[PDB]
Amino acid sequence: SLRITRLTVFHLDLPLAKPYWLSGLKFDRLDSTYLRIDTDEGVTGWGEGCPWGHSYLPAHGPGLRAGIATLAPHLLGLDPRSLDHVNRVMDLQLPGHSYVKSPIDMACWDILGQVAGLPLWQLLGGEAATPVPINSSISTGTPDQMLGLIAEAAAQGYRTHSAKIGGSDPAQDIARIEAISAGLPDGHRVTFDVNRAWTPAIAVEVLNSVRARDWIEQPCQTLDQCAHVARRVANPIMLDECLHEFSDHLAAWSRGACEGVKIKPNRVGGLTRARQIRDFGVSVGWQMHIEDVGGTALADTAALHLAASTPEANRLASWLGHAHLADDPIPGQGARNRDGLATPPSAPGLGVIPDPEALGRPVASYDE
Amino acid sequence: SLRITRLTVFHLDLPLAKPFDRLDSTYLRIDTDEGVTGWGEGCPWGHSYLPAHGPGLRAGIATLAPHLLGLDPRSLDHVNRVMDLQLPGHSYVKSPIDMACWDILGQVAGLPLWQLLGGEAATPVPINSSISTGTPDQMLGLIAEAAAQGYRTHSAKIGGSDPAQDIARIEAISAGLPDGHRVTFDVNRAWTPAIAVEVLNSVRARDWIEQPCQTLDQCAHVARRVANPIMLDECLHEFSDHLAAWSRGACEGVKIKPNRVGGLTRARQIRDFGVSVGWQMHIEDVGGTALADTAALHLAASTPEANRLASWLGHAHLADDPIPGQGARNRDGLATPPSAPGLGVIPDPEALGRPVASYDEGHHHHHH
Amino acid sequence: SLRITRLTVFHLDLPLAKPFDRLDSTYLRIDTDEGVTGWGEGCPWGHSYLPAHGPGLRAGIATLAPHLLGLDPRSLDHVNRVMDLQLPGHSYVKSPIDMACWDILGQVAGLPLWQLLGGEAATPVPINSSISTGTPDQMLGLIAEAAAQGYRTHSAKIGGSDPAQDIARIEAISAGLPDGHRVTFDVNRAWTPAIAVEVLNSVRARDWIEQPCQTLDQCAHVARRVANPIMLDECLHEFSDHLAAWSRGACEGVKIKPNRVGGLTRARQIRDFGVSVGWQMHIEDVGGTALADTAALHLAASTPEANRLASWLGHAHLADDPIPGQGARNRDGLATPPSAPGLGVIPDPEALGRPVASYDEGHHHHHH
């Protein structure tokens, strides 16, 4: 009886606070898509898809909007409360393209929350709007630079740190790892994030040279390569970018490839798909970072609802995308960082409402 | 801010239509502070079928009651976590509690359960018959009678220590089906691997065989050696058993029963897993009234059609009805779940009788 | 020192002969500074068949265009590496780009593509028919018609939720073939493992079964349990999927489609792997005009005869032809690739219409 009536697509140019200079490109800004879903009864949901550029994952801004175009005729007329059904239709009408699917799913969850009068964290089964620890991002440099950046991060109140390492020089990674692990303040945690920059050979060489037993995030490009490394080294392994769908998680589990995963809605295709993965992780005793790939506090809030509803023993720190942006299109809205922690809203649905006058003029609109 | 205020336990002596001649059923009413009230049923098929019995169910509620009081029943995963913390195992105890909390959530949301479980419609679900064991043409008599009733799937009970009569049963039934109709051979753990191998490799029929043997290991052994699709049921008590079954490659379908697996929250995760791996599923409860039948039918109706087989209605086997004209009933071999908010069945406490237990919150200045 | 100078994108609305009633095809012209010009086609079979759609293809070219400009198109592996760096996945986008660079390389070398892919001759390749689903003798009518045309291999479309009609289809078609002729049963992911096991073990026919199920895991399960050769297709998106299929022992053949795998450079590696492990292969594209058909036929013709099965020509299903009298065409159920340098098909831009996009190199002192 409830029925999707209009889909409206907006495009946001979001400059980064720290641009960086790629070898192939000055990586300057993010191409975010906001999606508004209107229904016949005046309940309206919002979703965000914002890929981390077009080189990070199988995802890009222009493809996201092109994907919505293709899906739009089929989403019109659906009951947005029947969430698994909406996902089935999307998967029927456009296979893959999980980055297209995530803001559509997110906006339907928003509608369902408003209709039920429940915040997303409660629909996802959580007892409370649990404050979720936020991790810092420590850029690559010397031993002394990164450890100075860590002391800076600790002063802002971060207690979990993502130290960015990697490159095909093993000896400087060894010196980075051993300095950072030995020079942490008390109670603080590091993850060493390699972001696929190692081959199995380099991974085996550095990790077997090192006394540190901290988390290693996604050392290699593929699951096969990562599972190879895991058999040969002594560190906990966190997987992330190689995990595109549920069957990849099933594969990671049966190989014994990891002790933790990151879950990111824009990688896996929304909150419906991300919740199934979360629940699987709980069942098998994974520890999990739950965040999105990038963009505004809109996407950040969606994933933090999943993070907060996740049991304490399985939940690790979240990352907030909007902390790295220089602009804010939804000021004072959604889940924000105060003293190293972020709390999701308890308002029905997603609890963040964009003003369309802050967003510019719609790039596309679809109705029937 | 919604809270559980009272738990009330009812016990129902239900005579069977075809006489072990009666069932011990437990009804559970859960009251809240805002006057929304949920119902659940747990009814083991005797005490000898599963790790489950009537007296144990009420002792389990007794054990769990102090911990359920004061919980938010909309927070369904949290409620399941507390129950698992406070009484490990005992999934037959937890099934009615989780059922009644789903009921509350649906009423609070204004949504029927099949929609909360993601389905697009109150889909009419095919019902299967139970054909009791006899001679070939005794059972072939009973199938024609069931076909006359409007059953299009049939569950024929076979098994024994004697291979020759089970061969004659299978080949007669399978060749002498009416057109369009399906038969499942339910052996119900009666075979050893040896007999299963001899029977199934002497037989031209390639119909479903439901749980040939006692254990997962034994069933996986049979499956490697025979040509039939294998359906698993009684050996699967939690999600990890389903994971083990998939990794062994032991089956191509599972039966999902809320009283075996610990309720609807646990059954849904299993269902979603089964859809992911391409299982076909019978979704039904273990026994009892149309209350437990309806809860399972909401899950069945919300399942994709490619993965959904016929349901079994327990109440069809009873002489008594405590909830007349209510819930999901057989209409020409189909059953449609209700589309009222929540479960869509409300017992009258006058039809049930006097409560065997009641559990309440108490004042701090109270004196006897 | 050869450089890409311009990329021009054309969009072609192609009506189907038998009406979903049209195809969205993309033609791509790549110009160089030395005046040698290459063409590619990418045409997904609707948007619902693979992770692939028309609008996404052009958005993908848009994303990739700045990075392709100024590359040497003779350096084919390098071109594929840049594309993989700049847009991960999206193999349907990359297929026309790689195709057009092969075209350039062939013209530059003075060699037809089948020779650059190592083949001794423009070998005439057997073509297979498509037999749409019906009754047994409907499909047996359509096979006799295809036999009259000169088809000696037939791809009969089967599948459904109903085992009994698929059994009757298979046994009639397989027994009622004309002598010398081959049938492949293409189910196209329509079966669950349960139905696949029941159907294939009820059937005397030992013909090819093409992709019974949705996933690699599900197909590997069926193969362990049945007697037919299994052909894999839609589940294989990159080289690592083919490696996984071989290590699982899931199949005895694969279909290779350039639009699924990311073009000719990726298809060749797969082809060479398949020859090494003793696979038999159908080599064809996903759909579209004789442009994409010809590119696939160059690969098919260069394949050893022991490993090569029949090709399918997409253009045979279209009402329109944008490139008349050109490329590889059916002659009595055989097709010979051209022996002109490169691809051996040059579109006229006047027959296509006005370009939907164009991308160019720009001067540094330029002002609007």
UniProtKB/TrEMBL annotation, chain A:
Pfam families xref list: MR_MLE_C, MR_MLE_N
Keywords noted in UniProt: Magnesium, Metal-binding
Region Disordered, annotated ranges: 328-367
Keyword Magnesium assigned: yes
Domain Mandelate racemase/muconate lactonizing enzyme C-terminal: 143-236
Family named by the database record: Belongs to the mandelate racemase/muconate lactonizing enzyme family.
Protein known as: Mandelate racemase/muconate lactonizing enzyme, putative
